[PDB]
Ligand binder design. Structure first.
Ligand code: CDL
Ligand code: CDL
Ligand code: 3PE
Ligand code: 3PE
Ligand code: 3PE
Lengths: 606, 125, 168, 11, 99, 50, 176, 459
């Protein structure tokens, strides 16, 4: 209990060190990118050990480090819950951010504030590690908001671009909408349990706990991407490919699913939460893949695919398979980062163009990234053993083996096919056709800072599922008893999607003009969700803020009523009483009226 | 066919005002452009002018702020639909929320008085 | 650390049964740790404890004589009410700490048992429910301006109803 | 090689 | 029109005092003012303030309270008594009104 | 030098005057010096507690 | 980004711009170069079929109908070059496009390096306080007193005079 | 306490018979030393409170207000320095004396024991503020602003005086903790309801209720930076202190004679956070922010729970610091551009790359970024109001959203676009104002590390 805890806190000390050199004067006399990358490397090597000790013993720990406050029977302290989830996610995220820092030192040259970029990356990593290892809702909220703000600071790197800022504020807005529910849950737990710690909160397994779960579900829809709060993730492609790869493929988007797995001891007995999960996550697998079938940008395609996979993980959460959802979280990062990686390689090789309609022959002009892209696409589709299988196969088996909703059970698979559809689209329009890009050619992918990270993430994407699934413990019994048309459905339908895509893409030839259609227009313009919501809701909110509150109430009526009325009244009475002309006759007649009134008062009351 | 809306406006192509060749159109366009160019020349005789230590002012921005801020009450006039909008916006929601909260509080209090409630672990408020 | 206040039950740790022929890193890693982290830090703490031992100092836990309660405290005499109210605030704070101790005693048991907390973590939950009932009967609905007099009014507004129940 | 315009940063 | 001076003009300070600090035109006074600020606000108050406040002991008895609570829990759990009762004041000394 | 550096004797003089007036105020209010039902001591080590 | 629109676009300009946009959206729709060339030749035939026509009313009618056909057959996700509006690089280096006057506040120990640079910057001012007065007269004297005016500017007609209002078209930052 | 007040009284001669070159330096240094000495109040080793005399006293609620008051002084000195720089030595000495008098009176009224002394000082706080706002403002509506401020305050304060007399007659004292150890319940009659109204309206005006918030935006927009700072930090807190002290005797009336104000607060919160989206004046935006934040304080005092009072105190201090910081940040630009219009100057963070951080952190606080005391207050107010009634969370979330919106709006329309390259008069950042911002921030870090000094009476 000395080696485990020391190894747990050492990674935080290390991650902090760079930011300490960021305040010192050594930056201008150090290679900050290389130093930070080595820090991340050693942090990963350190985090590898707790993983071994857990795989061996299966022992979880709670570590309270510092007393912050004592509020009248309610303590608050720094508390880390080192469990399977935390210790595995830490290793995965560090192993990924290593590759990402290297590829960033490659991709962001000519940017003077590359030091600032690296600092922000490591700060986000720290916030995510807090979120992931928190044994306390307040610490988890710290991580939540740190992620949400690092997103604003990274989407916005190019603060002259008037669209990156719109995207940043969009993310802020949606994540605050999720924070609403997060705070609702925190309040319910603080009142009905006088605590904020998983330990005490786990004694509400018999209580009703529907309102806090609704709150957490809203927070998950927010931080992750689901049909109600999804659009901010595609609009996050306005930022550099490294942050698109870290904050939007592997981290900052599995946060809600991590929340729900941490709170799985309470969703196990609420068939209204599990049933809105299963009927919502599936509504995104379909609605985004559709969107990912007629978009022309590699980044947007990848983001929509990420959203679809997240819907799939929410589906397997609803079907009561939290460990499976988390296994997918962890086996998804490898290839959904290597894909952004090869995308950014292709882009920086060309003249900063992301539209597939102006690239081709990559399979021959750029073998390395083509091979890695194909590997990632296969792993994503579900090829029998490339880190996709070990999670997606079990998910797609449980989906049909459980008693479920028979429309989700269908659209989930339709989207699982659209996966291979748009993957084949990428493959065919970027790596199989003729070079419809400009004529000047300065391709170069022979830089180790680019070759080694992808090599590494590819070894990962190939062997991580094996290495994990054959070491983790069996916290759930699966069903290996079923017909062939359920045991092979994922593979079969991925193949059918590939073939349908081959056909419909070869039809892109044949000199037959492309008559626009409403289906494709819908899938292209996002179902118009943004185009309409982001135009009505602002208009109403703002026309109200202006014409009603500021104008009608404040600058008009709350003036007309109190102060202007006082002034009018007193000025009028002033005029009345000071309209006097110096006439002694009138003054004395008034004196006489006064005398009469006084005599009368006296003689009457008496 | 494209049905315009106040949030998805009509383009310039489909605007029959465009393609109009009437002199009452082209003359007006020329005059508008002349005004625009006079203003741009005025502004560029200040931008690039050396010996300028300060910044450039914007009388249009000043007018806009003064209108949105201080020219409101001097032109305000009480009218029907104005008194009504004000009264509603000011009071209606307060009454709504008052009755919401009061119903909830009364219900909670009668429950507690009857003892029919479960306040397990509530030791903070 | 008094183990009676903080139980910390014992630890049933089993024998390592390496039914294989391939080595185990964790063991040699722990040995290397013992050699290159423990040894020097232990020596340093020994040195610091030496300095302590040679310049020790002692500090005492302050005792508080008991003063009259509100019950024998007149209805407007403040020299007594001050003493009584200070005493009540003191006991209120100590009760806060008691409840916090119970909760710190329950979280540990939950984390320890794990999947057996629904069967092996019951007496602690019962102590928690009981002390919760007591805290509720003493201090629940007083208010920001809580005081011994409000606590007494609560006590009496409870006891009159309990007396009615008793008689019928 | 060229000259990159920048503010002071000394203050 | 009427008699009045004309609006004055902006005035760069760095032109004459590139080592300007913000306080006064006189360079030595500027420097000594910034020095006094930095040495009385940062070097003393924040540092010694933080130190004193951190080494204020037993702020509002939150420590003695924990110690005494441990003592009480021990005493009571040892003598079989309960850890806390439902009535603060012993209902003997109290004298209720009879309806 | 004094005509420009004698103004450093006021504010510390004020601090000391304040401490002195506090001393006067607590020289008053002497009653209950040891008649508190909580801190009734026996004057064994000294002659005045406060 | 270098000129100003005229008070009104002429039928020729309208038709040319419609042709350009139609071809760009044809490119968007047809991903392959062979297809693009095929249908671009087809479209240019469609256009040339009505080049020797002169009836202005029927011409404007054909144009008003072709624009509607375009709005009905336009790609909703067309290709935009990166550095152009709607592109993924529009206003991306405005963060580093710092102006020139930001160097008048530099500190002697900052211009102590790049001394050969700042010496030129100086005489570039001497070339400005002298070339200013005559840039006004050239505008005053070249003014249309008949009221008419537009956003154009003349060159200098001398040896030594410089184009009026140059300091901001010159001296502007790189694009990078 | 007298060791805190006598030196503050001596800062005056120092100011007047100091040479025209060392007065600023000397008075600022000694003000910092006063801020330092004021930490004696934090030596609270027991639950017993401090009582130095029959006239003075300190509590866990009055100590933080007092220390913030003694800390803000040298900051206001430093900030009022660039302007009134050409102004005559005599005039600037007058300014310094006004500031010092405000300091002394605020310390007195926070350390007071008697409601009527509290009253005379809470009403003497008007003279210096009015004088600063009218004699050193730049517009022509500062006169009307002072009228509004002064007379709102006095109209609210008269009935409070009358109620204090009624009490001093029924009971024989206005002394605190005696009004506590002798308080009685009431009859729930109309006379006592009007007593409640009287006792409260003064403070409900001095911290702007929704409907009587029409003196704060004026005063801010028209006042100089030191006036803005003190108004935002402490003058909005006098009401909170007064209500937390006077609500002990009005029981049990506030259980039902508080609904209207809870409603007005929870609604005006939204209706001002929304104005913070479509206001053009940065100063008025920040004023409406102050209003939307004080609404929570009001609604939390109204419900009388320990968590509520704790959050009230935390948010009081936090908002004080943050509002002062934001006001000084806007002033830094005003001094360079002479226009409060926000959208005029843009694309900063290019020439002022560091002040763009202070701009950012002051925004991270206002939108309650954890870990921070802004949030440690908002959260507990939310929990208290959720226990009150679960339907308050709706309005709380709406306000949270609008806050997160307008904070980033204020950030982006000033620091995160592209520059107004036609701004030749952007004198680089002064060490003085960078130090202002640092002195504002660092104490927030320290109070976030040790929020035990900031909970209040209950905790
Ligand atoms: C629950 C978990 C448990 C742990 C809790 C931890 C807390 C919660 C963590 C979650 C936080 C969520 C929020 C994260 C996002 C925050 C936003 C942000 O990063 O702002 C940008 C901010 C500034 O970066 P920038 O935007 O690139 O600006 C650079 C400038 O251009 C200029 O660049 P430069 O080259 O000049 O850089 C030199 C550096 C120079 O840095 C300094 O000079 C700092 C002074 C060091 C003093 C050393 C003497 C001792 O200047 C700066 O970069 C920043 C200038 C502003 C100073 C920032 C001061 C921060 C508050 C410090 C409090 C002081 C406490 C001690 C005081 C002691 C008093 C007794 O990022 C930082 O570098 C600061 C790190 C803050 C992270 C704290 C959390 C650590 C984990
Ligand atoms: C060969 C190999 C040799 C290596 C062997 C290991 C070294 C062993 C050794 O040297 O023993 C030292 C020796 C060992 O004695 P010991 O056995 O540990 O006995 C304990 C002491 O009696 C206890 O006395 P103490 O109370 O004075 O201990 C020092 C004190 C230090 O602090 C102080 O109170 C005084 C220092 C204040 C600094 C004032 C100067 C400011 C200018 C800079 O500790 C603290 O209070 C920790 C403060 C924590 C600050 C950072 C916390 C960040 C929290 C962020 C807030 C947000 C949290 C959100 C969470 C939300 C969850 C819901 O003496 C010390 O322990 C004192 C060392 C002083 C370290 C100062 C640096 C600590 C870092 C923070 C302050 C930075 C300044
Ligand atoms: C109350 C009056 C209110 C008025 C405000 C104006 C104040 C002006 C006067 C100057 C300030 C005087 C002192 C301020 C309080 C200092 C508190 C302190 O001394 O720190 C104590 C702390 C140990 O705390 P202690 O109580 O002894 O032990 C129990 C656990 N707290 O020991 C320490 O932690 C000290 C070490 C400090 C290290 C700082 C490290 C920063 C860590 C980053 C945190 C970031 C959190 C904020 C991020 C979001 C903010 C936007
Ligand atoms: C060069 C710059 C100098 C700045 C100081 C540098 C050292 C850092 C000190 C800062 C930390 C302390 C801050 C808090 C001071 C408050 C404590 C205090 O002043 O106690 C009061 C004491 C009078 O003690 P008293 O019992 O009333 O009378 C007996 C006379 N022997 O009176 C005193 O003890 C005087 C304390 C001096 C305060 C300054
Ligand atoms: C633009 C706004 C308008 C500005 C102009 C203001 C016009 C002033 C109003 C005209 C005068 C009407 C008030 C007459 C006071 C009547 C006496 C009274 O109400 O006192 C009763 C109560 C004490 O009664 P109690 O102790 O129970 O026993 C009997 C007395 N020993 O003691 C009390 O309750 C004291 C009551 C003092 C008066 C309170 C006035 C209303 C308070 C709420 C609003 C305050 C804002 C200013 C007034 C607005 C208009 C009312």
């Amino acid at each position: 209990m000395n080696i485990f805890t020391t190894s747990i806190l050492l990674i935080f000390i290390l991650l902090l060190s760079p930011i300490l050199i960021s305040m010192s004067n050594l930056i201008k006399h150090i290679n900050f990118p290389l130093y930070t990358t080595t820090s991340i490397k050693f942090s990963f090597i350190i985090s590898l050990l707790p993983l071994l000790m857990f795989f061996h013993n299966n022992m979880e720990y709670m570590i309270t480090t510092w007393h912050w406050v004592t509020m009248n029977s309610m303590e608050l302290k720094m508390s880390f819950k080192t469990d399977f989830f935390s210790i595995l996610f830490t290793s995965v995220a560090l192993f990924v951010t290593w590759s990402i820092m290297q590829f960033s030192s490659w991709y962001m040259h000519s940017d003077p504030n590359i030091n600032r970029f690296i600092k922000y990356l490591t700060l986000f990593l720290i916030t995510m590690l807090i979120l992931t290892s928190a044994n306390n809702m307040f610490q988890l909220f710290i991580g939540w908001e740190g992620v949400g703000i690092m997103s604003f600071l990274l989407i916005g790197w190019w603060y002259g671009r008037t669209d990156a800022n719109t995207a940043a504020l969009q993310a802020i807005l949606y994540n605050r909408i999720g924070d609403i529910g997060f705070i609702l849950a925190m309040v319910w737990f603080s009142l009905n349990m006088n605590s904020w710690e998983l330990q005490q909160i786990m004694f509400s397994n018999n209580n009703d706990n529907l309102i806090p779960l609704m709150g957490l579900l809203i927070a998950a829809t927010g931080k992750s991407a689901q049909f109600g709060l999804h659009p901010w993730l595609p609009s996050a492609m306005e930022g550099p490919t490294p942050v698109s790869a870290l904050l939007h493929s592997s981290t900052m988007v599995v946060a809600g699913i991590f929340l729900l797995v941490r709170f799985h001891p309470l969703t196990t007995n609420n068939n209204f939460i599990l049933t809105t999960m299963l009927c919502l996550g599936a509504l995104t697998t379909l609605f985004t893949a559709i969107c990912a079938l007629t978009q022309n940008d590699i980044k947007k395609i990848i983001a929509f695919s990420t959203s679809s996979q997240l819907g799939l993980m929410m589906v397997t959460l609803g079907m009561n398979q939290p460990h499976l959802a988390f296994l997918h979280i962890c086996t998804h990062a490898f290839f959904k980062a290597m894909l952004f990686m090869c995308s950014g390689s292709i882009i920086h090789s060309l003249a900063d163009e992301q539209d597939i309609r102006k690239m081709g022959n990559i399979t021959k002009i750029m073998p390395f990234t083509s091979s890695c892209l194909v590997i990632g696409s296969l792993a994503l589709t579900g090829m029998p053993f490339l880190t996709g299988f070990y999670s997606k196969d079990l998910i797609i088996e449980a989906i049909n083996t459980c008693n479920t909703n028979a429309w989700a059970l269908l659209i989930t698979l339709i989207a699982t096919s659209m996966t291979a559809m748009y993957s084949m689209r990428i493959i065919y329009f970027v790596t199989m056709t003729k070079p419809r890009f400009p004529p000047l050619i300065s391709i170069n992918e022979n830089d180790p800072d680019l070759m080694n990270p992808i090599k590494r993430l590819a070894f990962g994407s190939i062997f991580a599922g094996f290495v994990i699934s054959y070491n983790i413990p069996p916290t759930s019994i699966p069903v290996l008893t079923m017909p062939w048309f359920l045991k092979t459905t994922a593979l079969i339908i991925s193949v059918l999607g590939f073939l349908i895509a081959l056909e419909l893409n070869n039809l892109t030839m044949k000199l037959s003009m492309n008559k626009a259609n409403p289906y494709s227009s819908f899938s292209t313009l996002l179902g118009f969700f943004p185009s309409i919501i982001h135009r009505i809701t602002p208009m109403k909110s703002l026309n109200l803020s202006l014409k009603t509150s500021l104008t009608l109430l404040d600058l008009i009526w709350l003036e007309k009523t109190i102060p202007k009325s006082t002034s009018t009244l007193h000025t009028n009475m002033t005029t009345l009483t000071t309209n006097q002309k110096g006439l002694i006759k009138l003054y004395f007649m008034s004196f006489l009226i006064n005398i009469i009134l006084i005599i009368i008062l006296y003689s009457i009351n008496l | 066919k494209y049905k315009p809306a106040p949030l998805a406006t009509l383009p310039s192509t489909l605007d029959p005002a465009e393609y109009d060749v009437s002199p009452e159109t082209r003359r007006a366009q020329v005059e508008r452009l002349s005004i625009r160019a006079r203003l741009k020349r005025e502004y560029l005789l200040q931008y690039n002018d050396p010996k300028r230590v300060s910044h450039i002012e914007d009388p249009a921005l000043i007018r806009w702020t003064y209108a949105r801020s201080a020219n409101i009450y001097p032109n305000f006039r009480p009218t029907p639909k104005n008194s009504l909008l004000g009264a509603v916006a000011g009071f209606g929601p307060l009454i709504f929320w008052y009755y919401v909260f009061k119903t909830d509080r009364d219900r909670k209090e009668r429950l507690i008085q009857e003892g029919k409630l479960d306040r397990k672990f509530n030791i903070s408020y | 650390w008094d183990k009676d206040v903080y139980p910390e039950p014992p630890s049933r740790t089993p024998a390592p049964s390496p039914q294989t022929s391939l080595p185990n890193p964790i063991t040699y890693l722990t040995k290397a740790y013992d050699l290159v982290v423990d040894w020097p830090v232990t020596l340093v703490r020994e040195f610091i404890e030496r300095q302590h031992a040679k310049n020790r100092t002692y500090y005492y836990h302050r005792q508080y004589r008991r003063v009259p309660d509100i019950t024998e405290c007149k209805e407007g005499d403040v020299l007594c009410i001050y003493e009584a109210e200070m005493q009540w605030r003191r006991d209120f704070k100590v009760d806060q700490e008691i409840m916090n101790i119970i909760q710190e005693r329950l979280k540990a048991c939950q984390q320890r048992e794990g999947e057996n907390y629904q069967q092996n973590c019951a007496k602690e939950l019962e102590q928690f429910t009981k002390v919760t009932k007591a805290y509720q009967d003493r201090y629940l609905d007083l208010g920001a301006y809580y005081s011994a007099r409000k606590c007494l009014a609560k006590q009496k507004q409870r006891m009159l109803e309990e007396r009615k129940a008793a008689r019928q | 090689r060229l000259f990159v315009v920048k503010p002071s940063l000394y203050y | 029109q009427w008699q009045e001076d004309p609006e004055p003009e902006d005035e760069n300070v760095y032109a004459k005092n590139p080592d300007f600090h913000g306080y006064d035109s006189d360079p030595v006074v500027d420097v000594w003012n910034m020095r006094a600020v930095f040495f009385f606000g940062f070097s003393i108050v924040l540092v010694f303030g933080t130190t004193f406040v951190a080494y204020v002991p037993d702020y509002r008895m939150q420590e003695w309270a924990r110690r005494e609570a441990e003592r009480l829990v021990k005493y009571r759990e040892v003598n079989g008594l309960p850890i806390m009762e439902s009535n603060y004041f012993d209902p003997s000394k109290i004298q209720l009104p009879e309806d | 030098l004094l005509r420009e550096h004698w103004v450093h004797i006021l504010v510390p003089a004020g601090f000391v005057f304040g401490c002195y007036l506090d001393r006067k105020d607590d020289e008053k209010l002497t009653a209950f010096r040891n008649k508190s039902m909580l801190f009734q001591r026996e004057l064994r080590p000294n002659e005045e507690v406060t | 980004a270098f000129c100003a629109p005229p008070a009104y676009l002429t039928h020729q300009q309208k038709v040319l711009r419609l042709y350009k946009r139609a071809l760009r959206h044809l490119e968007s729709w047809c991903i392959h170069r062979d297809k693009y060339r095929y249908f671009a030749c087809l479209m240019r035939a469609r256009f040339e079929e009505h080049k020797n026509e002169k009836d202005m009313m029927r011409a404007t009618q054909l144009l008003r109908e072709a624009e509607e056909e375009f709005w009905q057959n336009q790609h909703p996700q067309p290709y935009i070059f990166p550095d152009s509006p709607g592109g993924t690089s529009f206003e991306r280096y405005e963060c580093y496009k710092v102006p020139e006057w930001c160097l008048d506040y530099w500190h002697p120990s900052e211009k102590a390096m790049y001394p050969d640079y700042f010496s030129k910057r100086e005489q570039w001012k001497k070339l400005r306080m002298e070339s200013w007065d005559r840039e006004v007269k050239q505008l005053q004297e070249e003014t249309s007193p008949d009221g008419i005016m537009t956003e154009a500017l003349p060159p200098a007609r001398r040896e030594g005079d410089l184009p009026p209002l140059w300091w901001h078209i010159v001296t502007r930052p790189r694009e990078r | 306490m007298l060791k805190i007040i006598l030196p503050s009284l001596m800062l005056l001669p120092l100011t007047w018979l100091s040479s025209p070159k060392k007065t600023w330096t000397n008075v600022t240094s000694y003000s910092f030393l006063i801020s330092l000495t004021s930490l004696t109040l934090l030596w609270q080793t027991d639950e017993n409170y401090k009582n130095f005399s029959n006239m003075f006293s300190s509590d866990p609620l009055s100590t933080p207000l007092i220390i913030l008051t003694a800390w803000l002084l040298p900051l206001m000195l430093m900030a009022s320095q660039n302007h009134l720089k050409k102004d005559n030595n005599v005039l600037q000495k007058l300014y310094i004396s006004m500031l010092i008098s405000l300091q002394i009176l605020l310390i007195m009224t926070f350390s007071a024991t008697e409601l009527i002394m509290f009253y005379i000082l809470f009403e003497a706080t008007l003279i210096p503020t009015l004088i600063i706002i009218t004699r050193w403002g730049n517009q022509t509506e500062r006169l009307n602003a002072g009228i509004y401020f002064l007379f709102y305050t006095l109209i609210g304060s008269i009935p409070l005086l009358i109620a204090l007399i009624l009490i001093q007659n029924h009971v024989g004292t206005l002394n605190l903790m005696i009004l506590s150890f002798t308080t009685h319940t009431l009859d729930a009659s109309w006379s006592n309801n009007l007593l409640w109204l009287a006792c409260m309206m003064a403070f409900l005006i001095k911290m702007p209720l929704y409907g009587v918030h029409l003196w704060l935006p004026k005063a801010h927009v028209e006042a100089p930076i030191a006036g803005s700072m003190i108004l935002a930090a402490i003058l909005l807190k006098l009401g909170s202190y007064g209500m937390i002290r006077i609500s002990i005797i009005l029981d049990p009336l506030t259980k039902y004679m508080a609904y209207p104000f809870i409603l007005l607060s929870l609604w005006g919160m939204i209706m001002t956070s929304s104005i913070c989206l479509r206001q053009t004046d940065l100063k008025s935006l920040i004023a409406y922010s102050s209003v939307s934040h004080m609404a929570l304080v009001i609604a939390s005092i109204m419900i009388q729970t320990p968590w509520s009072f704790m959050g009230a105190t935390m948010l009081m201090i936090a908002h004080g610091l943050t509002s002062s910081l934001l006001f000084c940040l806007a002033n830094s630009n005003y001094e360079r551009i002479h226009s409060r219009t926000m959208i005029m100057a843009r694309g900063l963070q290019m020439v002022f790359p560091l002040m763009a951080t202070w701009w950012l952190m002051a925004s991270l606080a206002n939108l309650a970024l954890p870990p921070s005391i802004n949030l440690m207050g908002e959260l507990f107010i939310t929990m208290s109001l959720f226990s009150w009634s679960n339907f308050t969370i709706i309005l709380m979330g709406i306000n949270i959203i609008i806050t997160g919106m307008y904070s980033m709006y204020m950030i982006i329309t000033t620091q995160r676009g592209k520059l107004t390259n036609h701004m030749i008069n952007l004198q680089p950042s002064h060490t003085r104002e960078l130090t202002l911002m640092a002195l504002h921030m660092i104490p927030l870090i320290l109070l976030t590390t040790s929020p035990k000094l900031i909970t209040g009476l209950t905790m």
